[PDB]
Each structure stands twice: as structure tokens, then as C-alpha cells.
Symmetry: C3
Subunit: 428 residues, 3 copies
């Protein structure tokens, strides 16, 4: 009855409770929502008049030219190239090209042979196809290039070449037009006849003739085993690109790493998912095998054919399957990638067939089995942008709670005085 | 007193803004969230593949040619070989003897059996198979009848067996098969008919296991004499039901007579099947159900006309809405020459075929993930009910807050 | 109940007394403190919401809407060889010899002996100018006469299984010369529609690229390429073909499947974006309808006329066709200038409404052994010729489904006012009591 006696104090009392109820709910909802850290994406295109041409890494599918494999190399690495068994003579199986095998007989004869020093990197450098031999003609945006414009990079395919690498303090090339002309355009000889011969199915061996190619930002090392595409001989292969600029959101909204002036990677200048994974592979091999593979950076010693077989390969195989967690290599926030439409036509035309052959002193046959043209260019001089945009920033959370907090405080202040007014009366 | 002027003015404003936010709610606006999320495993997809040649020439018996001669377009409706200006005299000669019905008593015939017997055999075609470096064989392929005939789905997820997973991406770490398309068993063509094409190779569909193959429409071509790399990206799509969108609410029951799991493909096959049974009292070899297989006559005289009627001229019979939850695959095709000169002589010896044969018949198919990374594409509601109610909380904050202020006067 | 006696200790009643003398100033001081605090909040959030409005934020809405019909696109296709060797007359060789690079600027066949003795012998005869009186010459006429004839190239044509002929292909001059757009939508004729997608149910053509009519090549020049095949652009009918830049290559000896997806884009004008608001007024000298392609051709044309008092064969306008001389000495250099050294001259922004096409290229061999013998006899050619010259092109829709890609306004005016309204209306409700004490005291 002291409560009942309220005489419409009690309605005031409950209505303030009703309002404090409402305020808690709305403020909960808007704060629960803030914390899902919702985002949505903004697609756009914006025309440029210049575009920075990408890096173009390209590898022959054949790792080692047959000719350049010395008796010494065969002695150290014979088992690794699977040209020899574990007993360093020529495997039993008889499927082999008797003329080509004859040359391996001679090389693999070790009677009274004194071993010389051997180094995997040197072997790859010497034996790997030479851009100078492969590259029959080169034109960037109609201008002549030669082998001088190709920087050597060791990959898991061996001696490869990045064009417009942006390395060695030379400037990154730019296209001012789209279309078939205004790009890189190269004629390669894949030198099919220097291919390591295959007479037995092995874990190692393949039937491919051609090249793999990666188009990539200069701020990114080539990871061509995984990300590259195939170009076959006997076709001009057009590769129309679209530049794509991605902006992703860090945690808590997303997962990206903020690229800055400090790379945060032992062995590289710029953070990229590729750079990160190579850094990781390299660190881990050094740590667990006290050596690195030819294509890894650092001062460490190159693995010997035995450490390749008995330490490195097993360890890397472990790293991926049974030690996944060891290396989180998350995406950067700022990033540039390239769309690609492959299309092709036959090379050479009948009209041009007889000429090419004469000009390089090769059979017409050879041109059809060995010669390709690669036409990398921009379809359009414009880049697509793909931004993740925060759906609800703090400015908004406060905006929405803010006005309600300001008038609930105002009302609760009024209730403090009616509780002192009630107290005063009771007190007396 | 004066608060009449203010409180009405304010309640005016608040009722307006409250209707704006309700009109907005009812436009049921959405926008999309693209994301990439790195996984360490990925479920490898289903890979259905068909020879472009439906029936091996060898396996086509005199009896088959008698019943289905007009269907294979090897014969006209008079059981005669159409007058050819000039065919391959060698190939023609073998049709002469097959199509000779002197003394011939017709034996029993069944389209399904014909397809099963005559269709290319995976066991003949599949020279070499490797998943993730491991050996596979014909046991890892499941037969599916499609509108191209006897085809094979790899990693089907059917027959109990578990769905395979890639733990790394690249050229190696997926399916890698060497096929012989058996060019020499191709039905011969001496004249132009509706059926006549000039294609040699295979069609391939990469698809979710939760989805039957629709390879006539969705498959892509792979040529012989090339290793064709097919770098995929897994894409997980989430679409919004009505009123925001038109996707079909994903539930436990298929809502299709003949299929376990709802797919745009499953739905269209179900539809085609129901309609043909209803209108033609039979089904085609590749359709499910207990119905009787159509005879070559019903194929020609009932089924083909009915299907062709259904699509253009009877659109409305078949509403096959998209699932909300689903999985698709991006593809980059690229290719290199097969075999290399170095490897040419070996392949030939190893399969007892000419080097010639290898160049016209042998292909390699390399399906894999470019990166172990799935892209997500969600339609996300722009204004949920939780929010509209949140904002009319604005109205209750004045309503309660105004009445409390009125209690001070009285 | 001692608490009732003396009515609470003196200490307390005295407190209660201070309260009551002070109350009227607490009430005022608190409302001053609170009303200011609230008006502070209101001014801030109302600023924030207006700053945000003016960044004119947008975000994008992807959807896939099914349909039962789709308008089939335009398909422009060009032979990669610009001029058939046969149709090159003595007169043409005289005027344009240098342009086709069959002659140097000295009216001789470059000293080179690298060439086919048989094919060279026919150039000797043509390029003999002894006693020769030149006739009149016109680049457009030369292209029209010498360009490959669709009627010769097109061995078989089927739209959705129905037969088509050369009559169904409209001629367009491009920078590759005499080319052909199928389902152009020009000349009144209606735009074709597929009612179902898949390998059959679209355009399916067999071409002979006529390899043996290719201009012969013995010496490296800018024009010299070794390509044999065709380039193809799939494009909306509302858009001229820009096939040098946007086309893709199709090789002979393969059936090339080209599975398309229709894509409808809606982009936002300024201030949100940069697109050109659709008007039926083209605002383009030479075209009916705005496209980025139409705009760039218009520009190229205006600029060349302006700088070179002539146009190239493929450009519109009434201007005179450039002579082989003006092509070499004026036009090519000027266009090259326009792009590199005069970038800013030519502002060709994207339209807001438009339609694009996704493409998956895939291929199989042609012809099958079974069909090899037939094709050869049916066209009176070696089996050799079929493998080097014959291609099939299969353009179709993968599914009857268009994808929509809309930029949508993130914060429209309805919202800005709604929110500034809600805050202004919420502050009024709270500060009601302070309004009266501001008028009471004022009184
Ligand atoms: C980094 O991203 C921001 C995004 O606003 C941009 O201003 C800048 O040019 C980018 N720079 C890079 C990739 O280093
Ligand atoms: C789709 O199905 C999967 C099966 O595990 C489920 O986890 C998922 O929540 C569904 N996707 C969405 C976002 O509804
Ligand atoms: C063009 O105008 C508007 C939107 O910009 C819309 O109705 C539709 O997307 C377009 N309509 C056409 C091309 O008929």
C-alpha cells in the first residue's frame, strides 16, 4: 500500500523501467550488429591512359638440355634426373631411342673417371635452356627487345626468365594501347630435340612439349609450378589481360595483412602470399635440413642430390601435409592481379612456312613441333577495382546509440529528483 | 499549454521517418559480399567425361542396325544405306555386310542395352590415371547414361564411396588421365544428316557431387594431341529467398519424384522425365524412373517432338528455380603438345600403336585447383526486421519518454 | 519504532531541508547540463550523417535472373589475311605495293630470295610496269574487291539448326578489312533469339580461311605476321565491332566452342560514379547510339580528318578515303600521336546501361578420321587442305540466364533526411521541459 499509495508514482516508476528495457534492447541489437564486423564489396572500372605492364615469367617444360648434361653431372645427379638407377648405370627397360641412348652409354661410363666438384645451382644455370637460344624474336609495343630485357629466375622448373621484372633498378614498362600489337610478343623455339629422353615411366617423367607462363605483378615473385598456364608450340597464343586492383579489410572485419615499408619477411622486399610461402619453405628447409633448394633465396648452401632425395623433399612433403599450421601466409590488403582470356591461331601460315624454316635453318617439320608465338597484352586500357567496404563503422554505432543515451540520461535525472521528492515527504 | 505545439510537431516528424524506414524495409534491398577464405583441404569435384562418338562402330550388330539404323543415321527409313556420292570404300564395305538383311530374322532389341554394349568402354579409353600422384583405375569411375550415351563420372560421391580431397593445388595435385578416344571406332559419315558432326575428342563437365551431369549443355571440349590443364577455383554461392530473391529455400527433402538432392540440373531432368512418361508412356536411356525404355520408333515419332515442344512452345510447365546454397567452379583451360618427340617413340611401343595413332587419339586431362582457396559470393540483406524494430524503438523512446514528461505537470 | 519519535534524527531533517531550498536550482543546473549535452550529440551525429552523404558512397549488387529467351549477340569475324593474293591487280600493286609490303618504296620486290619461286614468279609478272599506264585507285574499292568473300569462306552455316547463307552476314570494314557481322541488327532485319542454350542451339559455322590466297611473306616488316585463322568479336548489336583490340583468335583444324553468359551492367553517374547518363541524343557526330567503341571510332575519325584531311576505309563520315601515301605519311603517325602524346584530347567515358558477354573457349579436333574423306571430296580439296584451312565455330549460351551487376547508392537522400529528421525529432522530445524553463525565466 506504500507502493499502491504511489498515486501514479507507480506508473511513472514502471514506464521509466519500460523505457530502460527498450534502451537496453535497441543498444544490444546495434552493438551485436557492430561486432559481426559486417562488410560488403564495391566493384568499379576506371579508365587509365597508361597502364604498367606486368611481369611475365616463362619456363621451358624441359628442365635440363640433354647436350649440356656432362659425365660429371650424370655421376652426381644421375639418380635425381632418373636418367640412372640407384646403381649409376642405365636402367634395364628397353623402350628407349637406341640412337639417343648410345650418347648416354658414353656419358654414363665411369671407368677410371675421377669426380670433379658439383653444384645444383651451377648445373641448372649451365644445363637449363638459354633464353638467348629459345628467343627467335621479341617486340614490346612494336619496339625490338632481346635476351637483355629478360632477367633469370630459378623456379621449381629450373632456369626461367621474367620479362619486365622491375628488378635491377630498371623501370617498369607501360602500355598506352590495348590489343594484339601493344604488348609483349615473343617467338620461342622450345628446342624439343634437347628434351631429356623417356624410356621408362617414372614418378618424375611427363610427355609435355611447350612452356609454362605466369603473368604477375612485379611486387610478387613467380610461383609458376602452381599458378602458371601452358602454351603449346605451333600456335600464336593471344593472352588478353585485365588489370584488377583489390582492397581487402584487415581483422577484425577480414584476414588481410597491411603491406607497409617493412616487408615482415626475412628474404623478400615486399609481402605477397607467394613471397611469404617461398620465405617459409626456405626458412623451414634450412632449419630442418641445413640446406636450401636452387630456387630459394638466402646465403645457405644448396642441397646435394643426396640431401634433395633423403632430407629436403621428405621435409617439404611433411611441411604441407602433417605440419600445415606452421606457416599462416595470409593475403595482403592492397593487391594487383590479372584476368586472362586465352585464344589461339595456327603458326606458321603456308605463305610464311617456307620463310621461317630458311630463316632459322630448320625443317618446316621442326617449326610446327618447336616454334610458338606468345602475345600478352591488355584487352582494354582500364582497371577493375574490387574493394571490401566496412558496413557499420564506429561513427555509426555511436550515431545510433548516441541520441537515445542523451535522452535516457535526461529522463533518469528527472527520476532521481522524484525519488528525492518521495524521500523528502516520507523523511518528514 | 505550449508542449502541444512541440510534442505534435515531434510526433509528426517521428511518424514520417518511421514510414520512410518501413517503405525501405519493403523494397527488400540486398547487396553482395565477395570474400576469399584459405582452406588446407578442399573436396575435389565430380568429373563426368564422354567420348564425342556415342556408339563404337565394331559393337553395332546387324540386329542393332535393323532396329536403330535410322536413329544412328547409318540407314534411311527403308533399311537401305543412303546413296553416297563417295564414302570411304573400306568403311562402306563393312556397313554393306552389316546392313544386309537377306535371310535375317529380327532378334530382341533394347536401347539401354545397346548404349551399354556399344558405348566406348572406360577400360579401353583410360590408358593412365593418377589422383594426387596416387594410381586410380576404371574402378574409380562410375557409369552414367547422358544424352551423349555411356559416360563416366570420377569422384562421383555415389555408391557409398567417400568424396576425394586435394590437400595442395597445382598441375599434379588433382585428377590426371590419359585417354585414347579410339578414333577408328567412330561411326563413319558418307553424307550430311541432322546428326552429322566432324568432331573428334571428349566433352567434360566439372560439377558438385550434389548435382547430376548435364554435359550436352554445360560440358567443354578437350582435343586429342594436347595435355589440357584445367585450373579450377571452388566458389560457394549463398542466394536469398523471396521476397529479396527467387532462390529455392534449401531443405532436407528434394521435392523431386526421382532425385535425392535439389539441383537446377536434377529439377530439369525430373521435369523432362515426368513429361515424357505422361505424354509418351516411356523414358529415354539417360532418364531415371521404373518406366519402360522408348523404342527407336517412340524416340523418333513421340519423344524428340515432345521435348522440342516442351522447351520453346510450353515454357511454363517446368519452373526450376535456383538453390540458395550451392557450389560452382571457375576454369582456366591452357594446353601443351603431346607427346614430346623425346616421349613419342616410348608411348607408341608401350600401347602397341603407331606414333601417327598417338597424335590423332591420345590426350591428357589435368584437372586441379589453382590455389587451395574458396571464393564466397553471398547476397546479404540490406535491412533485416531486427533493424526496423530497433528503429521504432526510436518511437517508443519518445512515447514512454513523452508520457513521463507529461506526469511532471499533473 | 524509535524512528517515529523525533521524526528522524536532526541531522537528516536538516539534509531534507537543504534539498528543498536547493531543488529548484539542481533541476535547472541538471537541465542546462543535459540539454547542452544532447544539443552537442545532435549537432555531431547530424554532421557525421551529412559528411557521409557527400562521399556519395555506392556498393554493388550481383544477381542471376533466369529468362526463357535471350537476344543472341552480334558476331563479327575477319580472315587474318586482309587481301586475297589472286585479286591483287597490277594497278593495285602499283599504288599500294609499299602498303602491302609486297614492294619497297623503290617499286621493286625486295632483293630477298627466301620466297617460293612459283608464287614469286606471279609477282614478277604483276610488278612489271614497263609500258603500264596507271588507272584510278581507291583503298575502299581495293579492300571490297581483294578482301576474302564470306560467300567463298562460309562452307556451312546453321542458327539453332536452321540453315543460314552469306545473305545472313552484313559486310563491315574494320582495320582488318572486309569483315562480316552475323545478327548485326542493321538494315531493319530483326535481332535473332535463342530459346535454349547448349553446343547446338546458337550460331555454328564452318569456314575455309583460304590459306593459299594469303599474301606471301619473305622479309620482316611491321605488317608481317605468320598467323593463319580468323579473329572474332562477340558484341551487343548497339555497339560497332572494335575487332583489332577486343576480338579473340580461332585456329583452323578445330571446332571451337564459345559458351557465353549475357551480363547486364547498371553503373551510377556522377556524383557517385563516372558513367554517361543514357540520352537518345547520341551527342556523337558519326553514330546513332553511345558506346565506348562508337565514341573511340568517332574520336579517331574526327582527329584524322582534322589533322590529315582524310579518313581510313573503316571510319564513317563523308570525308575522302586516305591514299596509300596519306596512310603511311599522315594517318598512322597521327593516330599513334593521338594515343601517346595527345591522350587528354578524347574523353570516352562508360555508359550507365550496357550489355557484355562472358566467354569460355574450348576445342576438339576437325575433322575426325571417319569424316576426313567425306569433307575433302565434298569441297574438292586434299585431306591436307581440310586440316590446314577448315575450322568450325560454335557460339552459344551456356544457360538461358543473364547476370546483373548494379552499383547501388549506399545512402540516398530519403535516408539522410530520415536520420537527421529522427535525431531532430528525438532531441525536441527530450528538451521539451528546458524549452518552458527558457521561456519562464525569459518572461
Ligand atoms: C595502396 O592502397 C591504397 C588504397 O586506397 C592506394 O591509395 C595506394 O595507391 C596503394 N599502394 C600500393 C599497392 O602500394
Ligand atoms: C550450406 O550447406 C552446408 C553443409 O555443411 C552448411 O554448413 C551451410 O551452413 C549452408 N550454407 C549456408 C551459408 O546456408
Ligand atoms: C536502362 O535504364 C534503366 C536503369 O538505368 C533500367 O530500366 C534498365 O536497366 C535499362 N532498360 C533498358 C535497356 O531497356
Amino acid at each position: 500500500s506504500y507502493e499502491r499509495l504511489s498515486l501514479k508514482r507507480a506508473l511513472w516508476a514502471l514506464c521509466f523501467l519500460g523505457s530502460l528495457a527498450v534502451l537496453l534492447c535497441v543498444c544490444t541489437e546495434r552493438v551485436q550488429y557492430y561486432f559481426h564486423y559486417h562488410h560488403v564489396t564495391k566493384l568499379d572500372e576506371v579508365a587509365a591512359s597508361q597502364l604498367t605492364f606486368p611481369a611475365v615469367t616463362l619456363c621451358n617444360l624441359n628442365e635440363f638440355r640433354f647436350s649440356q648434361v656432362s659425365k660429371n653431372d650424370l655421376y652426381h645427379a644421375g639418380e635425381l634426373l632418373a636418367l640412372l638407377n640407384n646403381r649409376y648405370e642405365i636402367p634395364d627397360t628397353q623402350m628407349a631411342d637406341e640412337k639417343q641412348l648410345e650418347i648416354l652409354q658414353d656419358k654414363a661410363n665411369f671407368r677410371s673417371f675421377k669426380p670433379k666438384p658439383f653444384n645444383m645451382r651451377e648445373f641448372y644455370d649451365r644445363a637449363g635452356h638459354d633464353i638467348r637460344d629459345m628467343l627467335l624474336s621479341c617486340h614490346f609495343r612494336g619496339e625490338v627487345c632481346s635476351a637483355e630485357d629478360f632477367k633469370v629466375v630459378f623456379t621449381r622448373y629450373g632456369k626461367c626468365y621474367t620479362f619486365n621484372s622491375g628488378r635491377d633498378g630498371r623501370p617498369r614498362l607501360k602500355t598506352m594501347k590495348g590489343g594484339t600489337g601493344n604488348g609483349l610478343e615473343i617467338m620461342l623455339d622450345i628446342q624439343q630435340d634437347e628434351y631429356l629422353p623417356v624410356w621408362g615411366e617414372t614418378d618424375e617423367t611427363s610427355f609435355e612439349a611447350g612452356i609454362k607462363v605466369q603473368i604477375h605483378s612485379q611486387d610478387e615473385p613467380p610461383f609458376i609450378d602452381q599458378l602458371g598456364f601452358g602454351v603449346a608450340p605451333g600456335f600464336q597464343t593471344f593472352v588478353a589481360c585485365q588489370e584488377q586492383r583489390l582492397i581487402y579489410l584487415p581483422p577484425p572485419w577480414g584476414t588481410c595483412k597491411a603491406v607497409t615499408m617493412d616487408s615482415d619477411l626475412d628474404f623478400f622486399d615486399s609481402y605477397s602470399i607467394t613471397a611469404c610461402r617461398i620465405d617459409c619453405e626456405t626458412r623451414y628447409l634450412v632449419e630442418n635440413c641445413n640446406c636450401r633448394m636452387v630456387h630459394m633465396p638466402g646465403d645457405a648452401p644448396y642441397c646435394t642430390p643426396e640431401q634433395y632425395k633423403e632430407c629436403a623433399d621428405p621435409a617439404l612433403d611433411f611441411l604441407v601435409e602433417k605440419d600445415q599450421e606452421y606457416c599462416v601466409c595470409e593475403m595482403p590488403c592492397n593487391l594487383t592481379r590479372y584476368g586472362k582470356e586465352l585464344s589461339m591461331v595456327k603458326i606458321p601460315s603456308k605463305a610464311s612456312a617456307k620463310y621461317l624454316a630458311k630463316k632459322f635453318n630448320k625443317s618446316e617439320q621442326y617449326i610446327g613441333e618447336n616454334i610458338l608465338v606468345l602475345d600478352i597484352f591488355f584487352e582494354v586500357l582500364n582497371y577493375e577495382t574490387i574493394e571490401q567496404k566496412k558496413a557499420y563503422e564506429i561513427a555509426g554505432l555511436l550515431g545510433d546509440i548516441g541520441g537515445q543515451m542523451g535522452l535516457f540520461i535526461g529522463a533518469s535525472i528527472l527520476t532521481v529528483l522524484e525519488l528525492f521528492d518521495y524521500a523528502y515527504e516520507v523523511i518528514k
